[PDB]
Design a protein around this ligand. Structure first.
Ligand SMILES: *[C@@H]1O[C@H](CO)[C@@H](O[C@@H]2O[C@H](CO)[C@@H](O[C@@H]3O[C@H](CO)[C@@H](O)[C@H](O)[C@H]3NC(C)=O)[C@H](O)[C@H]2NC(C)=O)[C@H](O)[C@H]1NC(C)=O
Ligand SMILES: *[C@@H]1O[C@H](CO)[C@@H](O[C@@H]2O[C@H](CO)[C@@H](O[C@@H]3O[C@H](CO)[C@@H](O)[C@H](O)[C@H]3NC(C)=O)[C@H](O)[C@H]2NC(C)=O)[C@H](O)[C@H]1NC(C)=O
Ligand SMILES: *[C@@H]1O[C@H](CO)[C@@H](O[C@@H]2O[C@H](CO)[C@@H](O[C@@H]3O[C@H](CO)[C@@H](O)[C@H](O)[C@H]3NC(C)=O)[C@H](O)[C@H]2NC(C)=O)[C@H](O)[C@H]1NC(C)=O
Ligand SMILES: *[C@@H]1O[C@H](CO)[C@@H](O[C@@H]2O[C@H](CO)[C@@H](O)[C@H](O)[C@H]2NC(C)=O)[C@H](O)[C@H]1NC(C)=O
Ligand SMILES: *[C@@H]1O[C@H](CO)[C@@H](O[C@@H]2O[C@H](CO)[C@@H](O)[C@H](O)[C@H]2NC(C)=O)[C@H](O)[C@H]1NC(C)=O
Ligand SMILES: *[C@@H]1O[C@H](CO)[C@@H](O[C@@H]2O[C@H](CO)[C@@H](O)[C@H](O)[C@H]2NC(C)=O)[C@H](O)[C@H]1NC(C)=O
Ligand SMILES: *[C@@H]1O[C@H](CO)[C@@H](O[C@@H]2O[C@H](CO)[C@@H](O)[C@H](O)[C@H]2NC(C)=O)[C@H](O)[C@H]1NC(C)=O
Ligand SMILES: *[C@@H]1O[C@H](CO)[C@@H](O[C@@H]2O[C@H](CO)[C@@H](O)[C@H](O)[C@H]2NC(C)=O)[C@H](O)[C@H]1NC(C)=O
Ligand SMILES: *[C@@H]1O[C@H](CO)[C@@H](O[C@@H]2O[C@H](CO)[C@@H](O)[C@H](O)[C@H]2NC(C)=O)[C@H](O)[C@H]1NC(C)=O
Ligand SMILES: *[C@@H]1O[C@H](CO)[C@@H](O)[C@H](O)[C@H]1NC(C)=O
Ligand SMILES: *[C@@H]1O[C@H](CO)[C@@H](O)[C@H](O)[C@H]1NC(C)=O
Ligand SMILES: N[C@@H](CC(=O)O)C(=O)O
Ligand SMILES: [Zn+2]
Length: 902
């Protein structure tokens, strides 16, 4: 029998009731350069089953407790056994307390410890974050427990189902503010031992998981609102950020979002207050700590003067995402990390709903389709994908837990939950969701519990009828990887499903309990009129007259792409859809206008339609005003540009795209009143952004003229930038491309003096658009200078230069030559050799370029490749796939573009 302290999962013999935790960060280094924090904790736990060992999580903590590493007491009049010894077991991250007798069922115990750890700049546990305010380097103390780092801050039963209440106290410099999950109990009091420090106690948390604790000590300030029901809302940030008003947008949307969710969930916001804090360089992006949500600055803050509308959209949706969790995930918590997909999937879906409430004119709900659905299908249409579900007993180690946090969990999770709500109807979905939240509040669940409560709601009504149980249906979508292509022969109405793979030669080796058959909800529209809903059962082939069509009629499946699948038709039906989009595109919903483009390019990749059919599906775009279908085209074609932009194919490609986008350019020229005023709603603003991007990058002279005029205007008056933030990336890029060292040097100056990261990013990126070899090389020569280019930006800047057809060889030459610099920067901060390699080799599509990559590899005899080792193999493999794709497609594609470019 194995010793329990060598098992990764905690015993269930002991369960925590409540913790006191007092943490004291020292924000002044100890002069060997070391920052520490000190802590003291008491955990009260209950014995469920007799045991003579206490096993609790501890990670990178030194114990200074008097006697053993802990002191153990009985609660009330319980006796306690004597401690034999305490030991730390590093591998399974345990503090192990061996006793001289057994704890007794039903008795409670208190275990007290004193400890310290490094306050490292490592974004894990209780950690430090360094940033600049004017001349001074500032340091704050903050937390990130997700997933298994609570134990790095204090000893705890660090699994999500083992919930307890927490009484947090912070000891901090008396001029800093302390924040935690809950409000402070009252005013801070001086630390008696040293009144330069103050003590801030917080109110007891609800019963909650350790991974959701947070506590922060900083100089931060806030903007505030008190909601109608007394809930205090604050946005926290650097003093200078607050004074500039950068917190206002987040404050604006937070109250409406909380309101939306309380109603959506049929459950009151379960806390007295809501803090959200913008942290500089918080690399984890955001974290849903209950009552104190952390964000990277650029995710939470918004500067109206310099920020694009896409920035605004990022803020409202990330807020909606994190706040969603304040019920789903935090109030009701998934019992184990194998079900992370339900938590993160759910939030990734409802973030659109919450944000839509905040910005109801923006049509934000549509964006899940490009943003999650088609995004994740790119990776879920591979043989190397994996099911949403993982057996709980395969997920044990902190590394295994971290692997749960991927595209499949978030984006496919979101996609399938969205499908589920749609086929249930939202009213029904909300009923079951409410039922589930009420039943399990302050406890833990599996995804089976949600299905069960949804089934209850289905069973409690007569209007929605399903072909099987909620569980049986969702099993198809959760227990096996991938999704089907649904193919329709409209001559007969025969409809079929098969597991969709982009690589039609791929072998799937992952077996499925269902033989890769799904139970598929299929909506359809015929001649622009909604049809009865249909379910495809778990069969390869079926027939329904719903999908049978006359010779003039057309049918289209999966309205708004609510279903997690792609659709193919016979060629005749494709043509009728094409004629429709040619003649009155309004008849087909805008999302489906995009779908036709998305699906057909994937189908073409998979050899299920010819590539010319996918291209034909772009022909209608010359009359398309809306964002999504154009985005579908541009996303699908970016690979074509990547493969062909050094080839004879490019001329006709540019020409075709100029033809298509010109009318849209003209449309916006008039609509915007000579570009003086942006379109009102988000989608049209996005469409304008892309139309100007597409026009300019494909050499529409009108756009080229506009870019030069605005950049000239800016250069004559540097303090008054005349370019609207929406348009900056294109206008900067195109204008530097047309210009020489005057435009480049000016933008360089602007970059050096930029105070905002997103404006800096745009400049850095546009600078790569120069058409002068000497400028691009000189620029490369800067990328390794941390005085001129931030290290964290070096590989990014190199990639942007690689992106320039002219900068391709220069960047490639630069990376090969300075490869001897992994052994400066696999020790001096990561880099991402991996993302650098992929970017610079992305274009490679010939035998000759492969012979080059192979020759570059023969620097194996030392330095190696670091964190980018594996991505070098991927480059070699991707190049082979590129060589084969270009040989298959070059002739067909060239002659299509020639034929259609006038
Ligand atoms: C976890 O932390 C809690 C908060 O500090 C502890 O509860 C507090 O204990 C204090 C002292 O033990 C009590 O404060 C005062 O102490 C004097 C001692 O001179 C007592 O007479 C009084 O009971 C008390 N004064 C008042 C006005 O109540 C607090 O009562 C008490 N705070 C509470 C209950 O909210 C917990 O004991 C601690 N848990 C463990 C297991 O140690
Ligand atoms: C938790 O305890 C650890 C083990 O006791 C500490 O790790 C040790 O830190 C020591 C002091 O910081 C290091 O010892 C030496 O430090 C002196 C001056 O401080 C130097 O002369 C030496 O260069 C250095 N020793 C060596 C061998 O280079 C130890 O390196 C180190 N020991 C281990 C086993 O890691 C932690 O610092 C302590 N952490 C906290 C937060 O309290
Ligand atoms: C948080 O919400 C606030 C209230 O809704 C917004 O405050 C609004 O800012 C708008 C943009 O600055 C102002 O609109 C126009 O501002 C120009 C300034 O020169 C004026 O010409 C217009 O008269 C004015 N619009 C109208 C309709 O009068 C609003 O004045 C102002 N609204 C209110 C109620 O104060 C914030 O913009 C918003 N913060 C963010 C970052 O979105
Ligand atoms: C954290 O603080 C809370 C609130 O003061 C403590 O809750 C008290 O628990 C004691 C003994 O368990 C009860 O007699 C009181 O009724 C509780 N008060 C409330 C309002 O619930 C809790 O015990 C503290 N946790 C620890 C570990 O000491
Ligand atoms: C909190 O108090 C400390 C010490 O009085 C201040 O920290 C000093 O700030 C000055 C700039 O005014 C720096 O030159 C010193 O090096 C800082 N000392 C340390 C140890 O960092 C701090 O500015 C005060 N903060 C607030 C918000 O009042
Ligand atoms: C949760 O939903 C319930 C049930 O739909 C809400 O209760 C209804 O509230 C309306 C408000 O006018 C009443 O007319 C209905 O009669 C109520 N129905 C029942 C069964 O009580 C309830 O308000 C919601 N609760 C929260 C906290 O959001
Ligand atoms: C994990 O959640 C389950 C519920 O899904 C908790 O079990 C419930 O506990 C409450 C309060 O003791 C009881 O009223 C219910 O009868 C229980 N339901 C069950 C056992 O199915 C369970 O306590 C949680 N696990 C931990 C370790 O806290
Ligand atoms: C549509 O599906 C039907 C089957 O449901 C196919 O018709 C069958 O084809 C086989 C060919 O060997 C015949 O032996 C069966 O008797 C046919 N069943 C009939 C006519 O009811 C038909 O080929 C399919 N058409 C397609 C996919 O275009
Ligand atoms: C397909 O999605 C579109 C949005 O792209 C939906 O259109 C919205 O419909 C709701 C209610 O019908 C309106 O409140 C919105 O104003 C509509 N927006 C637009 C831009 O039309 C449409 O309802 C969806 N279709 C189906 C069948 O679900
Ligand atoms: C998969 O197996 C078949 C052998 O029948 C082969 O066509 C193919 O080359 C194998 N591997 C891949 C990646 O296609
Ligand atoms: C195109 O169809 C839309 C909606 O289906 C309709 O309202 C409009 O009249 C049609 N336009 C023309 C020119 O027929
Ligand atoms: N739970 C977090 C993960 C993290 O903080 O990295 C998110 O999905 O934003
Ligand atoms: Zn999340």
């Amino acid at each position: 029998q194995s010793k329990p302290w060598n098992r990764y999962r905690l015993p269930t013999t002991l369960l925590p009731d409540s913790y006191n935790v007092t943490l004291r960060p020292y924000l002044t280094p100890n002069a060997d350069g070391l920052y520490i924090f000190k802590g003291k904790s008491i955990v009260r736990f209950l014995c469920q089953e007799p045991t003579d060992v206490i096993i609790i999580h501890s990670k990178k903590l030194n114990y200074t407790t008097q006697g053993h590493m802990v002191v153990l007491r009985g609660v009330g009049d319980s006796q306690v056994p004597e401690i034999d010894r305490t030991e730390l077991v590093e591998l399974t991250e345990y503090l192990v307390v061996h006793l001289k007798g057994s704890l007794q069922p039903g008795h409670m115990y208190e275990m007290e410890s004193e400890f310290q750890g490094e306050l490292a700049d490592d974004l894990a546990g209780f950690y430090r974050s360094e940033y600049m305010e004017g001349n001074v380097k500032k340091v704050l103390a903050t937390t990130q427990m997700q997933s298994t780092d609570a134990r790095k801050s204090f000893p705890c039963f660090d699994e999500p189902a083992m919930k307890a209440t927490f009484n947090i106290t912070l000891i901090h410099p008396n001029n800093l503010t302390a924040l935690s999950n809950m409000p402070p109990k009252g005013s801070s009091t001086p630390l008696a031992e040293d009144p330069n420090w103050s003590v801030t106690e917080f109110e007891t948390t609800p019963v909650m998981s350790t991974y959701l604790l947070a506590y922060i000590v900083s100089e931060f300030q806030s903007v505030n609102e008190t909601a109608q029901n007394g809930v205090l809302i604050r946005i926290w940030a650097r003093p200078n950020a607050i004074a500039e008003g950068h917190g206002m947008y987040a404050l604006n949307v937070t109250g409406p979002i909380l309101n939306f969710f309380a109603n959506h969930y049929n459950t009151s916001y379960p806390l007295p207050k809501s803090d959200q804090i913008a942290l500089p360089d918080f690399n984890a992006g955001a974290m849903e700590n209950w009552g104190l949500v952390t964000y990277r600055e650029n995710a939470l803050l918004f500067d109206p003067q310099s920020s694009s509308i896409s920035n605004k959209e990022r803020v409202v949706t990330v807020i909606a995402h994190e706040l969603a969790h304040q019920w789903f995930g935090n109030l009701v918590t998934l019992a184990w990390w194998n079900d992370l997909w339900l938590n993160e999937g759910f939030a990734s879906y409802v973030e659109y709903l919450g944000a839509d409430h905040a910005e109801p004119t923006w049509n934000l709900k549509d964006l899940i389709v490009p943003g999650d659905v088609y995004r994740v299908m790119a990776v879920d249409a591979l043989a190397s994908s994996h099911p949403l579900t993982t057996p709980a007993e395969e997920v044990n180690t902190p590394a295994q837990i971290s692997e749960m946090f991927d595209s499949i969990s978030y984006s496919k999770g979101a996609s399938v939950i969205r499908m589920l709500s749609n086929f249930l109807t939202e009213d029904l979905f909300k009923e079951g969701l409410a039922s589930y939240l009420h039943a399990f509040a302050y406890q833990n669940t599996t995804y089976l519990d949600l299905w069960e409560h949804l089934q209850k709601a289905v069973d409690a009504q007569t209007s929605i009828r399903l072909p099987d149980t909620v569980r049986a249906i969702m099993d198809r979508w959760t227990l096996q990887m991938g999704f089907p292509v649904i193919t329709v022969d409209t001559k007969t109405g025969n409809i079929s499903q098969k597991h969709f793979l982009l690589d039609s030669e791929s072998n799937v080796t992952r077996s499925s309990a269902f033989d890769y058959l799904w139970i598929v909800p299929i909506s359809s529209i015929k001649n622009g009129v909604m049809q009865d809903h249909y379910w495809l059962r778990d069969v390869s082939q079926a027939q329904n007259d719903l999908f049978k069509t006359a010779s003039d009629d057309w049918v289209l499946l999966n309205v708004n792409v609510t279903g997690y699948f792609q659709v193919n038709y016979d060629e005749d039906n494709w043509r009728m859809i094409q004629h429709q989009l040619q003649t009155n595109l309004s008849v087909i919903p805008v999302i489906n206008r995009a779908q036709v483009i998305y699906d057909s390019f994937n189908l073409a990749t998979a050899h299920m339609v010819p590539v010319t059919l996918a291209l034909d599906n772009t022909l209608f775009l010359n009359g398309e005003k809306e964002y999504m279908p154009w985005q579908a085209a541009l996303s699908s074609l970016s690979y074509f540009s990547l493969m062909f932009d050094r080839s004879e194919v490019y001329g006709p490609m540019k020409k075709y795209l100029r033809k298509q986008v010109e009318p849209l350019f003209q449309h916006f020229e008039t609509l915007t009143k000579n570009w003086t005023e942006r379109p009102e709603n988000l989608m049209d603003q996005y469409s304008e952004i892309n139309a100007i991007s597409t026009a300019c990058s494909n050499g529409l002279p009108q756009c080229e003229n506009l870019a030069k005029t605005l950049f000239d205007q800016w250069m004559s008056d540097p303090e008054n930038n005349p370019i609207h933030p929406n348009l900056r990336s294109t206008i900067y890029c195109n204008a530097i491309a047309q210009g020489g060292q005057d435009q480049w040097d000016f933008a360089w100056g602007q970059l050096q003096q930029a105070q905002l990261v997103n404006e800096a990013d745009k400049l850095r990126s546009a600078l790569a658009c120069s058409n002068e070899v000497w400028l691009l090389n000189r620029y490369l020569g800067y990328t390794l200078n941390p005085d001129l280019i931030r290290k964290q930006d070096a590989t990014s800047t190199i990639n942007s230069i690689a992106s320039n057809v002219i900068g391709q060889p220069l960047a490639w030459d630069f990376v090969q030559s300075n490869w001897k610099k992994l052994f400066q920067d696999y020790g001096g901060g990561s880099f991402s050799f991996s993302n650098l390699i992929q970017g610079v080799t992305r274009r490679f599509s010939s035998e000759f370029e492969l012979q080059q990559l192979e020759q570059f590899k023969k620097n194996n005899m030392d330095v190696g490749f670091g964190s980018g080792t594996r991505a070098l193999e991927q480059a070699l493999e991707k190049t082979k796939a590129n060589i084969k794709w270009v040989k298959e497609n070059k002739e067909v594609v060239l002659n299509w573009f020639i034929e259609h470019s006038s």
